[PDB]
Design a protein around this ligand. Structure first.
Ligand SMILES: COc1cc2cc(c1Cl)N(C)C(=O)C[C@H](OC(=O)C(C)C)[C@]1(C)O[C@H]1[C@@H](C)[C@@H]1C[C@@](O)(NC(=O)O1)[C@H](OC)/C=C\C=C(\C)C2
Ligand SMILES: Nc1nc2c(ncn2[C@@H]2O[C@H](COP(=O)(O)OP(=O)(O)OP(=O)(O)O)[C@@H](O)[C@H]2O)c(=O)[nH]1
Ligand SMILES: Nc1nc2c(ncn2[C@@H]2O[C@H](COP(=O)(O)OP(=O)(O)O)[C@@H](O)[C@H]2O)c(=O)[nH]1
Ligand SMILES: [Ca+2]
Ligand SMILES: [Mg+2]
Lengths: 59, 421, 440
């Protein structure tokens, strides 16, 4: 009966830990995908500044 | 509900944009005042996707009208269903783009975009659950092309987890005599391939050839071309507007239609321009595509087809299998069951039954190759380049857009030649 | 006691819940308002139907069920339907944005926003139980919620309820009514993730149900409504042993002992008889022998496969209605001397039999003829691995090119989860092959 308790607890434990790792791993990956997207959008805004600057330095 | 925020930019965007709102207003049974006078409850079950409900059962289009010149604004406001649009959602400049992509994207448009974003944010924040945006514009001009692609980038920065859809009208010498349009188109495609999730490629070449060769309309007016666009735009949104199981929203459509993120350019089709067999055969025929491409010159990655009207649903299933079986070579085998069929039992105006087609075909490269053919000849000439560099643009930004479109074509070719084993 | 809590996830789970709970109400004489005149113990009881219905002081019999969907239009039909009074509003849980046929959105992006609220409402039902037996989970394989959110729920249920039994009714995708090209991906992902957390799963192949509706009920284009009323009959036969009492009644848990020889081999094949139209049932009585022999015609199976090319590891017959053991034994003796019935060599060949005297029931205006006797066979056959093989092949075709995978990676998943899930399916296919080999 001590083994049955142990094995029941080990299944709950491994399920709890396996899930917590996935949600943490998934949060990082999704955020990192969103961060890379904004950075690419943010570097086209910086490019537009260089373009508008270049029109003012044309006259 | 799941609201879509509509945006129409430039002349082309506002022209086809207004007709789109005219057609679906009638299909949902609302008058140019905004009151409902219909007969079927299906018209109102999913009305909030495109309309804001105001006090007194007044339905107001969730639409934002944009242009760098105030001309088109008076046309829409005076045209039918002009008094239904929200006055505050009109955002017009005075300068005018003059078919300069740089003006729309970097100079003139960059100074109006913020007052547009204020209207986008105000509409968005009032959405129960915003699903995304749909933009109507052309790629050959300057405002709809240059500013249209600026707004998309700006909106994506604040709503990166939403779907960005566009109805992009592709330039053709058969309709517009402007010669620089392949510059604006190439520069736009460089942006649409990066910042949109679904683009309906409305090709003026196909619209012209249809009116001239099938409808026998020598000297076709813009009204004739836009009647096809309006019927098409009504068809490819039926699944969003009426109760349905299949591609009921913008995200579920993208998941079914886009196997690779860059390959998100659809060629739509419509029928008639009847029996279920020949409705199905027409919609898969090259003459009924709204993009000047032959689908039998490539393979279908995915296909969405919606039938409208009262018809035998057993027959639609039987005939969609028949077309897939007799054209098995034209559907990629490494995507099982890539053709999806929807059926909405409320037909369009005038037709007892119709069929709309949405194909992700590798034959779309034929359209991008046409633009590239014009663009490449203009670039060697270095014809009309000072107007772009005059606004601060570089010569590399032209080269980069060219090579990105070459990659898009070769990527569409890669998967056309790919096999299962 | 021995209460069972039903959890209906996604459109398929919800819409199948409507059919099942409507059918249960008609079987027990429960009205749409929850009143049950025949039930004289007001406010509680220990009767067999109390395993699935709780009782309020006002005499209302309330399903021990939770409905969950990450979008509100399917559950709205329950909230405004014929049986809206049957459920407490807290049993009907909806989000605002569905999973868009994406396992990642159902398990992570959208599911994590509502998983805690759902578990709280399930806990609220469980605390009303004096002897909770386990859970029944209804969901599709193809949808983003049915796949993604279900596997999240099953993981969380294993943490909060340990090894309490968890049963699945899983809708296996078919192209005739498919809604997404990526349903093979969601199928493999949810099967891999739930495998460790489910004790027994009854797969229902939509193509199997679709074909039966066309051939046996003369339905030209079967709808979800046609399919669900047939599915609810199979579900009602399987749960009948929990909801009714009787001398020859055998509890589903006793069958479970026989049906699951190893933990991963917990996918029984269901076969129901008779599926016949009123037009055809007229002046035609289906005897015990006829409906029993029909259980070994592959055309009547809930999953497309050929048991004649497999081996049996268990065979259970769940009769209901006018059936006496005598006729069962005669029908079985005939079948054993005429069919392609082969057991593995490490298991006895005897058929386990259960009889519930409560006759089959049909919903008004339904396509099934009302018959005096029905039977649902639950068998554990290696042949069911053919269903895995078909799903895995379609998965492989798309995953070789990474088609649509970017929709999943964008929501936080990694390609390692696809390969891990597919490797598990390959081990499962080998498992079903190994159990079929003869002993040395
Ligand atoms: C005497 O010969 C010609 C004289 C003109 C044009 C042509 C020929 Cl040949 N050709 C070949 C064309 O194809 C037309 C086209 O312009 C058109 O859009 C249209 C209004 C004509 C254009 C210049 O390539 C377009 C952009 C570079 C655009 C031009 C502009 O619109 N503004 C701007 O910044 O850039 C500008 O000022 C308002 C007016 C028009 C220009 C002038 C130069 C006439
Ligand atoms: N048998 C059956 N299958 C159904 C039914 N409704 C949907 N399905 C199947 O469910 C799968 C698609 O998932 P759905 O149930 O539609 O949706 P969901 O589970 O809520 O998931 P989302 O798409 O994320 O909303 C496909 O295999 C459909 O055929 C139904 O009433 N009966
Ligand atoms: N089909 C169609 N094309 C249009 C319409 N208006 C403009 N276009 C196309 O748009 C291109 C020029 O861009 P336009 O929209 O006129 O100008 P913009 O506002 O400066 O972008 C040409 O290829 C035209 O054919 C219209 O109403 N219908
Ligand atoms: Ca009682
Ligand atoms: Mg759903």
């Amino acid at each position: 009966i001590q083994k049955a308790i142990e094995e029941n607890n080990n299944f709950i434990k491994m399920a709890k830990e396996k899930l917590a790792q996935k949600m943490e791993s998934n949060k990082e990956n999704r955020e990192a995908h969103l961060a890379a997207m904004l950075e690419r959008l943010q570097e086209k805004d910086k490019h537009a500044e260089e373009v508008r600057k270049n029109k003012e330095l044309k006259e | 509900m799941r609201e879509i925020v509509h945006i129409q930019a430039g002349q082309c965007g506002n022209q086809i944009g207004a007709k789109f709102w005219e057609v679906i207003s009638d299909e949902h049974g609302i008058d140019p005042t905004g009151s409902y006078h219909g007969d079927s409850d299906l018209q109102l079950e999913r009305i909030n996707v495109y309309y804001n409900e105001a006090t007194g059962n007044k339905y107001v289009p969730r639409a934002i009208l944009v242009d760098l010149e105030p001309g088109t604004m008076d046309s829409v406001r005076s045209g039918p269903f002009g008094q239904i649009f929200r006055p505050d959602n009109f955002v017009f400049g005075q300068s005018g783009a003059g078919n300069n992509w740089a003006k729309g994207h970097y100079t003139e448009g960059a100074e109006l975009v913020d007052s547009v974003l204020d209207v986008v944010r105000k509409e968005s924040e009032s959405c129960d659950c915003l699903q995304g945006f749909q933009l109507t514009h052309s790629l050959g001009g300057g405002t709809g092309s240059g500013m249209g692609t600026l707004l998309i980038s700006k909106i994506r920065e604040e709503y990166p987890d939403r779907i960005m859809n566009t109805f992009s009208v592709m330039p053709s010498p058969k309709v517009s005599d402007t010669v620089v349009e392949p510059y604006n188109a190439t520069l736009s495609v460089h942006q649409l391939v990066e910042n949109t999730d679904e683009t309906y490629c409305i090709d003026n070449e196909a619209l012209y050839d249809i009116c001239f060769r099938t409808l026998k309309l020598t000297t076709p007016t813009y009204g004739d071309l836009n009647h096809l666009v309006s019927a098409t735009m009504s068809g490819v949104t039926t699944c969003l507007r009426f109760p349905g199981q299949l591609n009921a929203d913008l995200r579920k459509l993208a998941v079914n239609m886009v196997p690779f993120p860059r390959l998100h350019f659809f060629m739509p089709g419509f029928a008639p321009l009847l029996t279920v067999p020949e409705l199905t055969q027409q919609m898969f025929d090259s003459k009924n595509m709204m993009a000047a491409c032959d689908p039998r010159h490539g393979r279908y990655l995915t296909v969405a087809a919606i039938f409208r009207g009262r018809m035998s649903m057993k027959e639609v299933d039987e005939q969609m299998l028949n077309v897939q079986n007799k054209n098995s070579s034209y559907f990629v085998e490494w995507i099982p069951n890539n053709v999806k069929t929807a059926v909405c039992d409320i037909p369009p105006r005038g037709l007892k039954m119709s069929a709309t087609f949405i194909g992700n075909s590798t034959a779309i490269q034929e359209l991008f190759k046409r633009i590239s053919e014009q663009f490449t000849a203009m670039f060697r000439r270095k014809a009309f380049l000072h107007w772009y560099t005059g606004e601060g643009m570089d010569e590399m930004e032209f080269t980069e857009a060219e090579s990105n479109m070459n990659d898009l074509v070769s990527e569409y070719q890669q998967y056309q030649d790919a096999t299962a084993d | 006691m021995r209460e069972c809590i039903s959890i209906h996830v996604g459109q398929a789970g919800v819409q199948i819940g409507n059919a099942c709970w409507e059918l249960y109400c008609l079987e027990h004489g429960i009205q749409p308002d929850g009143q049950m005149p025949s039930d004289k113990t007001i406010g509680g009881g220990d009767d067999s139907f109390n395993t699935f219905f709780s009782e309020t002081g006002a005499g209302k019999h309330v399903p021990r069920a939770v409905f969950v969907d990450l979008e509100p239009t399917v559950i709205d039909e329950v909230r405004t339907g014929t049986y809206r009074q049957l459920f407490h509003p807290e049993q009907l849980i909806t989000g605002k944005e569905d999973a868009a046929n994406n396992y990642a959105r159902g398990h992570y992006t959208i599911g994590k926003e509502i998983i805690d609220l759902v578990l709280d409402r399930i806990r609220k039902l469980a605390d009303q139980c004096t002897g909770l037996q386990g859970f029944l989970v209804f969901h599709s394989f193809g949808g983003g919620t049915g796949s993604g959110f279900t596997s999240l729920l099953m993981e969380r249920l294993s943490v909060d309820y340990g090894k309490k039994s968890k049963l699945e009714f899983s809708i296996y995708p078919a192209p005739q009514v498919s809604t997404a090209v990526v349903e093979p991906y969601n199928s493999i992902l949810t099967t891999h993730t739930t495998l460790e957390h489910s004790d027994c799963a009854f797969m229902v192949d939509n193509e199997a149900i679709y074909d039966i509706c066309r051939r046996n009920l003369d339905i030209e284009r079967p709808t979800y409504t046609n399919l669900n009323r047939l599915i609810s009959q199979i579900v009602s036969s399987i749960t009948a042993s929990l909801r009714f009492d009787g001398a020859l009644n055998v509890d589903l848990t006793e069958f479970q002992t026989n049906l699951v020889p190893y933990p991963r081999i917990h996918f029984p094949l269901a076969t129901y008889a008779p599926v016949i139209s009123a037009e055809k049932a007229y002046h035609e009585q289906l005897s015990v022998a006829e409906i029993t022999n029909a259980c070994f015609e592959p055309a009547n199976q809930m999953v497309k496969c050929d048991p004649r090319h497999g081996k049996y590891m268990a065979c259970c017959l769940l009769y209901r209605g006018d059936v006496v053991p005598k006729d069962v034994n005669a029908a079985i003796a005939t079948i054993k001397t005429k069919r392609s019935i082969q057991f593995v060599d490490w298991c006895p060949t005897g058929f386990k039999v259960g009889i519930n005297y409560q006759p089959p029931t049909v919903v008004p205006g339904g396509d099934l003829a009302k018959v005096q006797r029905a039977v649902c066979m639950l068998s554990n056959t290696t042949a069911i691995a053919e269903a895995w093989a078909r799903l895995d092949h379609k998965f492989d075709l798309m995953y070789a090119k990474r088609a649509f995978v970017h929709w999943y990676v964008g929501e936080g998943m990694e390609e390692g989860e696809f390969s891990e899930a597919r490797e598990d399916m390959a081990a499962l296919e080998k498992d079903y092959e190994e159990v079929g080999v003869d002993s040395v």
